[PDB]
Amino acid sequence: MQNGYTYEDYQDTAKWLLSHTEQRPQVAVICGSGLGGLVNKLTQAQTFDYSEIPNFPESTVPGHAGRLVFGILNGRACVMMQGRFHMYEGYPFWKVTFPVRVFRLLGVETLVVTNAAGGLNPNFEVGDIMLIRDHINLPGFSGENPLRGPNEERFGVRFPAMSDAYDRDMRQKAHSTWKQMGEQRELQEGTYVMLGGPNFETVAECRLLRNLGADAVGMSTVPEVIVARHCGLRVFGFSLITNKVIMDTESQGKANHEEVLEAGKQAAQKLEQFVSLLMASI
Amino acid sequence: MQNGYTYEDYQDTAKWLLSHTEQRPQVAVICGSGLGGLVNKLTQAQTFDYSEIPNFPESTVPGHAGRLVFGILNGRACVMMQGRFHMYEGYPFWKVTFPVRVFRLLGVETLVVTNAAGGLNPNFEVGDIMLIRDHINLPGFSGENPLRGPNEERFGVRFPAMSDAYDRDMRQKAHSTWKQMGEQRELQEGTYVMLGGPNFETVAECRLLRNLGADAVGMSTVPEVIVARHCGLRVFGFSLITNKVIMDTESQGKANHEEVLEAGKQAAQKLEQFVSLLMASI
Amino acid sequence: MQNGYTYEDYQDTAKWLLSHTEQRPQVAVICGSGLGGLVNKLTQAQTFDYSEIPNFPESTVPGHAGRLVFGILNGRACVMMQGRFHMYEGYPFWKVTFPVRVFRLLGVETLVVTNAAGGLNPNFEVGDIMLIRDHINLPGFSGENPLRGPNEERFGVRFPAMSDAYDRDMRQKAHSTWKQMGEQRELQEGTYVMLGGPNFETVAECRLLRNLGADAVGMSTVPEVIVARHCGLRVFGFSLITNKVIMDTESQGKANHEEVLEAGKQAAQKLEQFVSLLMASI
Ligand code: HPA
Ligand code: HPA
Ligand code: HPA
């Protein structure tokens, strides 16, 4: 398989956005978890439904449609994705990552990715925020990769490196900012592992994932980071630990979508101010 | 990719079966290993070749065609799949699992899955029967999942839990029943790991599989359990350890399909009476 | 999915080659790394561009097109693939492995595979040559396998064993030959792990790969060995360690395609004489 989008498809979509808004963002943010309300803090906001933008993959999100919002957050011009695409919905990785390449063509230089994740690291608690220090790409091991197919030289190289995907300087800025917020809990940092989903893991699967060294497990983000790094975007991301995974055979209960939603709801306040504060440091 | 079957496809097939037999099963059994002869113990049996049932995936099995047999086993009304589908034959998971959803629509409430597996756990011996306590889904890690694509709300939820896939109470019943059979060998219990096949594993692959915590390795069953749990079927399954995997570089010999067949032949007698006895406890 | 080539497709291509050259090779070699110049040591060489051979997958290689070269190397009649196909370019495994089955139909009995790999084993140094003793097939775990689909009985069996894929006797011959070359460095030997690519691994991915027991990591070769063993070809292969993988978070630098190329350039001299010497021992 190969990318179903020609370079021209990306630029056509980009040219369309440019001619419909005066906003010219430098930062792009893909919202997840309780970051959904972040759009409410933008100034001079302009919203575009995914369905009205040519070439954009059609979709929505939990309880709300997918919208692309342009605006100024804490003095920084940015564009946000309110709702993303997941392979478990049927989308191939080249559709999932379509927005990342368009952002590049709009002049965006920094990408901020966020998600909800199940905690594998025993020291994590629900509500914890983990800076993504590194990732493990399981679908990648099998060849499921957004870069599979002929390489588009206009975006990047054939064999991009990933060992430096998560910007070091940004992670440092994140720690300083967290300190200034006076938070009692420590800002976590670790390895995110991605799998396909949509079902939740079994005890045995969680144990091996942890033994493989992963700290948090999720069903997104990685394809986006790959493509973003391929085209030279500075990347920074974090996971909202929405639940602790059942690692014990004596299952007291089980992971449920409801609980991850509640967590996203309860941490929204601090997630938003955290991202807002970081804008100034980018 | 998404499921190529609409909800209506499943119900059409179900309505067809209902109008062609007076049997109304509560239990569904997918036979593997030496359980192939189990059909011979059914009362008021009615057989349907897979090729005469609308929408059913076409196929067969080792030395025999695939047939759907309805009948009463030890006082319990059930339907059995004599031969299953495997991804290594070319079938996508949505074809492999087609029967599971039809069983649901027929009124079936319990699913019994059996298979042949290579023993990874050093304490296992050829002929051993292992109750599946948990599973590791390698194809799932890459996105190869029977639930990939839009979710059919009429079957279940978008994010189903799998940590409780193998019924606890049923596994307890299995141990009691095994005791009543006066078997000298202990009833094993463990983690089953699934991979695609059709080739047999290498020494290095077997060592990592064991390190990942798996007790037995096979090329089926997991997709069926996923779909079954998604639609609310109580699941119980076991593996017939047909051979011990070569974990030593000094390969004395090598896994062969012939030997797994012999094992299936020699254990048939006890596999059948075991499943027969369990019917009363469901 | 299934193989898109019928048995007849393979034999048509084979018959075409036979009627266009008087060469009748017993050995087939798939060149990688610095082995690209090996064609320059052939006698009575005859070259065929991949694009002029019916049914052959279209492609090329780094800095040069793909060519099939027939010739005599150190007294042995062989055919060489100057450039191979990779799944990361978009090719399904049944296209990648097409040449292996044609070689079989030409009368070839031995296959020599070579590649460039990143060193995971701490004792390896750039320039090291590692005899492939065993492999780990990650894409295989998910079902991505060149044998997926209906089995062609005219090539081999439905469930081929892989625990003896790398010929024992050949590896012994390789050690003796290396000794006769007076090389100061020891001939390495180990497990090769394959992943899809095209991006290079992250620190976390490299650590788990090493923990899984792999010594070298690459993006090819395994599909070819599978198919070759399926049709009864004696297989022998080795990896040129082109770089040491970044296993440390304090990334001093990062894997780059340039460096792997330099390594391939600097070791070419000994790679060629090594393969040349081995011809006599086959
Ligand atoms: O437990 C989980 N598992 C996988 N993905 C998740 N996303 C949020 N929680 C989880
Ligand atoms: O050794 C084995 N490996 C994989 N699947 C199997 N099914 C029966 N035996 C085996
Ligand atoms: O570091 C590496 N990683 C993966 N494949 C490779 N092929 C050469 N070097 C490498």
CSV table of C-alpha atoms in Angstrom, one decimal, chain A:
chain,number,residue,atom,x,y,z
A,1,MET,CA,0.0,0.0,0.0
A,2,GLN,CA,1.0,3.6,-0.5
A,3,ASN,CA,-0.2,7.1,0.4
A,4,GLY,CA,-3.4,7.9,-1.5
A,5,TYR,CA,-2.7,11.6,-1.3
A,6,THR,CA,-0.5,13.4,-3.9
A,7,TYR,CA,1.6,16.3,-2.7
A,8,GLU,CA,-0.9,18.5,-4.6
A,9,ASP,CA,-3.8,17.2,-2.5
A,10,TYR,CA,-2.1,18.6,0.6
A,11,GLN,CA,-1.3,22.0,-0.9
A,12,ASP,CA,-4.8,22.3,-2.4
A,13,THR,CA,-6.3,21.8,1.1
A,14,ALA,CA,-3.7,24.2,2.6
A,15,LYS,CA,-4.4,26.9,-0.1
A,16,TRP,CA,-8.1,26.6,0.7
A,17,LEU,CA,-7.7,27.2,4.4
A,18,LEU,CA,-5.3,30.2,3.8
A,19,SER,CA,-7.9,31.8,1.5
A,20,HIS,CA,-10.6,31.4,4.1
A,21,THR,CA,-9.0,32.8,7.2
A,22,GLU,CA,-6.5,35.5,8.0
A,23,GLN,CA,-5.0,33.4,10.8
A,24,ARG,CA,-1.5,32.2,10.2
A,25,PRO,CA,-0.6,29.7,13.0
A,26,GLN,CA,3.0,28.7,14.0
A,27,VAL,CA,1.8,26.0,16.5
A,28,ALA,CA,-0.7,23.1,15.8
A,29,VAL,CA,-2.3,21.2,18.6
A,30,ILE,CA,-4.1,17.9,18.4
A,31,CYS,CA,-6.5,17.8,21.4
A,32,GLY,CA,-7.3,14.6,23.3
A,33,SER,CA,-8.6,13.9,26.8
A,34,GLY,CA,-9.8,17.0,28.7
A,35,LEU,CA,-8.1,19.3,26.3
A,36,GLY,CA,-11.3,19.4,24.3
A,37,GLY,CA,-12.4,22.6,26.0
A,38,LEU,CA,-9.1,24.4,25.1
A,39,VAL,CA,-10.9,26.0,22.1
A,40,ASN,CA,-12.9,28.1,24.5
A,41,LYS,CA,-9.7,30.0,25.5
A,42,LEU,CA,-8.8,31.1,22.0
A,43,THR,CA,-9.1,34.7,20.8
A,44,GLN,CA,-10.2,35.6,17.3
A,45,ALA,CA,-11.2,32.0,16.9
A,46,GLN,CA,-12.4,30.7,13.5
A,47,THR,CA,-13.9,27.2,13.2
A,48,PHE,CA,-14.0,24.9,10.2
A,49,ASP,CA,-15.9,21.6,10.3
A,50,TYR,CA,-13.8,18.8,8.9
A,51,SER,CA,-16.6,18.1,6.4
A,52,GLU,CA,-16.3,21.5,4.7
A,53,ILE,CA,-12.6,21.4,4.1
A,54,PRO,CA,-11.7,19.7,0.8
A,55,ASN,CA,-9.7,16.4,1.1
A,56,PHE,CA,-10.0,16.3,4.9
A,57,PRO,CA,-10.9,12.9,6.3
A,58,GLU,CA,-14.5,12.8,7.4
A,59,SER,CA,-15.2,12.0,11.1
A,60,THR,CA,-16.0,13.4,14.5
A,61,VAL,CA,-15.2,12.4,18.1
A,62,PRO,CA,-16.8,11.3,21.4
A,63,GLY,CA,-20.0,13.4,21.8
A,64,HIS,CA,-18.8,16.0,19.2
A,65,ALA,CA,-18.0,16.5,15.6
A,66,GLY,CA,-14.4,17.1,14.4
A,67,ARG,CA,-13.6,20.7,13.9
A,68,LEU,CA,-10.4,22.6,13.0
A,69,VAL,CA,-10.1,25.7,15.1
A,70,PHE,CA,-7.8,28.7,14.4
A,71,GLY,CA,-7.1,31.2,17.1
A,72,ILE,CA,-4.7,32.9,19.4
A,73,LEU,CA,-4.0,31.1,22.7
A,74,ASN,CA,-2.0,33.1,25.4
A,75,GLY,CA,-0.5,35.3,22.7
A,76,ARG,CA,0.4,32.5,20.3
A,77,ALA,CA,-1.3,31.9,16.9
A,78,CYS,CA,-2.3,28.3,16.6
A,79,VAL,CA,-4.6,25.8,14.9
A,80,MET,CA,-6.3,23.0,16.9
A,81,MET,CA,-7.8,19.6,15.9
A,82,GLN,CA,-10.9,19.1,18.0
A,83,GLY,CA,-11.2,15.3,17.4
A,84,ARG,CA,-8.7,13.0,15.6
A,85,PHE,CA,-8.8,9.9,13.5
A,86,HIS,CA,-8.0,6.4,14.7
A,87,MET,CA,-7.0,3.2,12.8
A,88,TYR,CA,-9.6,1.3,14.8
A,89,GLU,CA,-12.4,3.3,13.0
A,90,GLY,CA,-11.1,1.9,9.7
A,91,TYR,CA,-8.8,4.7,8.6
A,92,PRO,CA,-5.5,3.7,7.1
A,93,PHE,CA,-2.5,5.7,8.5
A,94,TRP,CA,-2.2,7.9,5.5
A,95,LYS,CA,-5.7,9.3,6.2
A,96,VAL,CA,-5.1,9.6,10.0
A,97,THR,CA,-2.0,11.7,9.4
A,98,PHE,CA,-3.4,13.9,6.6
A,99,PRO,CA,-3.8,17.0,8.8
A,100,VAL,CA,-0.1,16.9,10.0
A,101,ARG,CA,1.2,17.5,6.4
A,102,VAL,CA,-1.3,20.3,5.7
A,103,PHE,CA,-0.2,22.0,9.0
A,104,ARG,CA,3.3,21.9,7.6
A,105,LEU,CA,2.2,23.5,4.4
A,106,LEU,CA,0.5,26.3,6.3
A,107,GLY,CA,3.7,27.4,7.9
A,108,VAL,CA,3.3,25.5,11.2
A,109,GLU,CA,6.6,24.7,12.9
A,110,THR,CA,5.6,23.1,16.1
A,111,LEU,CA,3.2,20.3,16.9
A,112,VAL,CA,1.7,19.5,20.3
A,113,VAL,CA,0.0,16.1,20.6
A,114,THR,CA,-2.1,15.0,23.6
A,115,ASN,CA,-4.0,11.8,24.4
A,116,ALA,CA,-5.7,9.7,27.1
A,117,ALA,CA,-3.7,6.6,28.2
A,118,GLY,CA,-4.0,3.7,30.5
A,119,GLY,CA,-1.2,3.7,33.2
A,120,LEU,CA,1.2,0.7,33.1
A,121,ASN,CA,3.8,2.3,35.4
A,122,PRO,CA,2.8,1.4,39.1
A,123,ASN,CA,3.7,4.9,40.3
A,124,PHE,CA,1.1,6.5,38.1
A,125,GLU,CA,-2.3,7.6,39.5
A,126,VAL,CA,-5.5,8.5,37.6
A,127,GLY,CA,-5.2,12.2,36.7
A,128,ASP,CA,-1.4,12.1,36.3
A,129,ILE,CA,0.0,13.9,33.3
A,130,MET,CA,3.0,12.1,31.6
A,131,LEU,CA,5.3,13.9,29.3
A,132,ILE,CA,5.9,11.6,26.4
A,133,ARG,CA,9.7,11.0,26.4
A,134,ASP,CA,9.7,8.2,23.9
A,135,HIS,CA,7.3,5.8,22.1
A,136,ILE,CA,7.1,2.1,21.1
A,137,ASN,CA,5.2,1.6,17.8
A,138,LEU,CA,3.7,-1.9,17.7
A,139,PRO,CA,1.8,-1.4,14.4
A,140,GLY,CA,5.1,-0.2,12.9
A,141,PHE,CA,6.8,-3.5,13.7
A,142,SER,CA,4.4,-5.2,11.2
A,143,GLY,CA,4.7,-2.6,8.5
A,144,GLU,CA,1.6,-0.6,9.3
A,145,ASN,CA,3.3,2.8,8.9
A,146,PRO,CA,2.1,6.2,7.5
A,147,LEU,CA,5.3,6.4,5.4
A,148,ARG,CA,4.8,3.1,3.7
A,149,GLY,CA,4.9,3.4,-0.1
A,150,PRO,CA,6.9,5.8,-2.4
A,151,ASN,CA,8.7,8.6,-0.4
A,152,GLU,CA,7.6,12.2,-1.2
A,153,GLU,CA,10.9,14.0,-1.3
A,154,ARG,CA,9.1,17.3,-0.8
A,155,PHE,CA,8.2,16.4,2.7
A,156,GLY,CA,11.3,14.6,3.9
A,157,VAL,CA,13.8,11.7,3.6
A,158,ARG,CA,13.3,8.0,2.9
A,159,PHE,CA,14.7,6.8,6.2
A,160,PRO,CA,13.9,9.4,9.0
A,161,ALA,CA,15.3,8.9,12.5
A,162,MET,CA,12.9,8.7,15.4
A,163,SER,CA,15.3,8.5,18.4
A,164,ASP,CA,15.0,12.3,18.8
A,165,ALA,CA,11.2,12.7,18.0
A,166,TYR,CA,10.2,14.3,21.3
A,167,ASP,CA,11.9,17.6,21.6
A,168,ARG,CA,14.3,17.8,24.6
A,169,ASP,CA,14.1,21.6,25.1
A,170,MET,CA,10.3,21.5,25.1
A,171,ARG,CA,10.3,18.8,27.8
A,172,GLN,CA,12.6,21.0,29.9
A,173,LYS,CA,10.2,24.0,29.5
A,174,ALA,CA,7.3,21.7,30.5
A,175,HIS,CA,9.0,20.9,33.8
A,176,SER,CA,9.8,24.5,34.7
A,177,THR,CA,6.2,25.5,33.8
A,178,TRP,CA,4.7,22.7,35.9
A,179,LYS,CA,6.8,24.0,38.9
A,180,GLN,CA,5.5,27.5,38.4
A,181,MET,CA,1.9,26.2,38.7
A,182,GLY,CA,2.5,25.0,42.2
A,183,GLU,CA,1.1,21.5,41.5
A,184,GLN,CA,1.5,19.1,44.4
A,185,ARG,CA,1.8,16.1,42.1
A,186,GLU,CA,5.0,15.5,40.2
A,187,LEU,CA,5.0,15.8,36.4
A,188,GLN,CA,5.6,12.3,35.1
A,189,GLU,CA,7.6,11.4,32.0
A,190,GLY,CA,7.9,8.2,30.1
A,191,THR,CA,7.4,5.8,27.2
A,192,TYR,CA,4.1,5.6,25.4
A,193,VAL,CA,3.2,2.4,23.6
A,194,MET,CA,0.6,2.3,20.8
A,195,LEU,CA,-1.6,-0.6,19.8
A,196,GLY,CA,-4.6,-0.8,17.5
A,197,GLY,CA,-7.6,-1.2,19.7
A,198,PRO,CA,-10.6,-0.7,20.0
A,199,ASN,CA,-10.9,-3.3,22.8
A,200,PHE,CA,-9.1,-2.8,26.0
A,201,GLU,CA,-6.1,-5.0,26.9
A,202,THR,CA,-6.1,-8.3,28.9
A,203,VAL,CA,-4.1,-8.8,32.1
A,204,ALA,CA,-1.5,-10.8,30.2
A,205,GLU,CA,-1.1,-8.2,27.5
A,206,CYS,CA,-0.7,-5.4,30.1
A,207,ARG,CA,2.1,-7.4,31.9
A,208,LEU,CA,4.1,-7.9,28.7
A,209,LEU,CA,3.6,-4.3,27.7
A,210,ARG,CA,5.1,-3.2,31.0
A,211,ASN,CA,7.9,-5.7,30.7
A,212,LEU,CA,8.7,-4.3,27.3
A,213,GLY,CA,9.3,-1.0,29.2
A,214,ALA,CA,6.1,1.0,28.4
A,215,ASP,CA,4.7,3.4,31.0
A,216,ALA,CA,1.4,4.2,29.3
A,217,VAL,CA,-0.8,2.5,26.6
A,218,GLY,CA,-3.0,4.1,24.0
A,219,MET,CA,-4.5,3.8,20.5
A,220,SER,CA,-3.2,6.9,18.8
A,221,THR,CA,-0.6,9.7,18.5
A,222,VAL,CA,2.4,7.7,17.2
A,223,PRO,CA,1.5,7.8,13.5
A,224,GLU,CA,1.2,11.6,13.8
A,225,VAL,CA,4.6,12.0,15.5
A,226,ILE,CA,6.2,9.9,12.7
A,227,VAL,CA,4.8,12.0,9.9
A,228,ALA,CA,5.5,15.2,11.8
A,229,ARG,CA,9.1,14.3,12.3
A,230,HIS,CA,9.4,13.2,8.7
A,231,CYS,CA,8.5,16.7,7.5
A,232,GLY,CA,10.6,18.5,10.2
A,233,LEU,CA,8.0,19.6,12.7
A,234,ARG,CA,9.2,20.1,16.3
A,235,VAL,CA,7.1,17.7,18.4
A,236,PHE,CA,5.9,17.8,22.0
A,237,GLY,CA,3.3,15.6,23.6
A,238,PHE,CA,1.7,14.2,26.8
A,239,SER,CA,-0.7,11.6,28.1
A,240,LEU,CA,-3.5,12.1,30.6
A,241,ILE,CA,-3.5,8.9,32.6
A,242,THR,CA,-7.2,8.2,32.6
A,243,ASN,CA,-7.1,4.9,34.4
A,244,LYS,CA,-4.8,2.3,36.0
A,245,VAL,CA,-4.7,-1.0,34.0
A,246,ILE,CA,-5.9,-4.3,35.5
A,247,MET,CA,-2.5,-6.1,36.0
A,248,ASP,CA,-4.0,-8.6,38.5
A,249,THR,CA,-5.9,-11.8,37.6
A,250,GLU,CA,-8.2,-11.1,40.5
A,251,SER,CA,-9.9,-8.4,38.5
A,252,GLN,CA,-11.7,-6.1,40.9
A,253,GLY,CA,-13.3,-4.6,37.9
A,254,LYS,CA,-12.4,-3.5,34.4
A,255,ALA,CA,-11.4,-0.6,32.2
A,256,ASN,CA,-14.4,1.3,30.9
A,257,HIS,CA,-14.8,4.2,28.5
A,258,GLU,CA,-17.0,5.9,31.1
A,259,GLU,CA,-14.2,6.3,33.6
A,260,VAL,CA,-11.6,7.5,31.1
A,261,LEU,CA,-14.2,10.2,30.2
A,262,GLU,CA,-14.7,11.2,33.9
A,263,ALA,CA,-10.9,11.6,34.3
A,264,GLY,CA,-10.8,13.7,31.1
A,265,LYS,CA,-13.5,15.8,32.7
A,266,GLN,CA,-11.8,16.3,36.1
A,267,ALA,CA,-8.4,17.2,34.7
A,268,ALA,CA,-9.5,19.6,32.0
A,269,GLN,CA,-9.0,22.6,34.2
A,270,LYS,CA,-5.2,22.0,34.7
A,271,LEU,CA,-4.6,20.5,31.2
A,272,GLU,CA,-5.8,23.7,29.6
A,273,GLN,CA,-3.9,26.1,31.8
A,274,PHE,CA,-0.8,23.9,31.4
A,275,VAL,CA,-1.0,24.0,27.6
A,276,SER,CA,-1.8,27.7,27.8
A,277,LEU,CA,1.3,28.5,29.9
A,278,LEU,CA,3.5,26.5,27.5
A,279,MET,CA,2.5,28.6,24.6
A,280,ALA,CA,4.6,31.4,25.9
A,281,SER,CA,7.7,29.1,26.1
A,282,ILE,CA,7.5,27.7,22.6
